[PDB]
Design a protein around this ligand. Structure first.
Ligand SMILES: [Cu+2]
Ligand SMILES: [Cu+2]
Length: 128
């Protein structure tokens, strides 16, 4: 089964899916994020961050408070299962993570932590 997915971060602030399914068959999984538009990361940055559904809000909140300079992530946030860099327009980033970190039966959220983006740029990831 495929073990990769193309996700995109927008001016318009939208993701092309609000749902990812990672085949249980996969040992690693990669997300390729990319950014349509013309604006710099300091103004319209996008990342893709993965955590447990429970943790999502804390990760978003602590990341907003850590600044641009930490890519909108609290440093050493152990709730983050995986994440890309914070990217701006014309920039791409990929993250590959161990599928051993995902427990079948858990609910995962992916989201962007640039201030305010996670209200639209959010989605479900499930292991199947
Ligand atoms: Cu496969
Ligand atoms: Cu964004």
């Amino acid at each position: 089964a495929e073990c990769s997915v193309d996700i995109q971060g927008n001016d318009q602030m939208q993701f092309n899916t609000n749902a990812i399914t990672v085949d249980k068959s996969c040992k690693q999984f990669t997300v390729n994020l990319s950014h349509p538009g013309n604006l710099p990361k300091n103004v319209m940055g996008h990342n893709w961050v993965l955590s447990t559904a429970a943790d999502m809000q804390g990760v978003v909140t602590d990341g907003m408070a850590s600044g641009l300079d930490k890519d909108y992530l609290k440093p050493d946030d152990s709730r983050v299962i995986a994440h890309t860099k914070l990217i701006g327009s014309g920039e791409k980033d990929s993250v590959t993570f161990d599928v051993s970190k995902l427990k079948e039966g858990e609910q995962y959220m992916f989201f962007d932590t640039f201030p305010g983006h996670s209200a639209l740029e959010k989605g479900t990831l499930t292991l199947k």
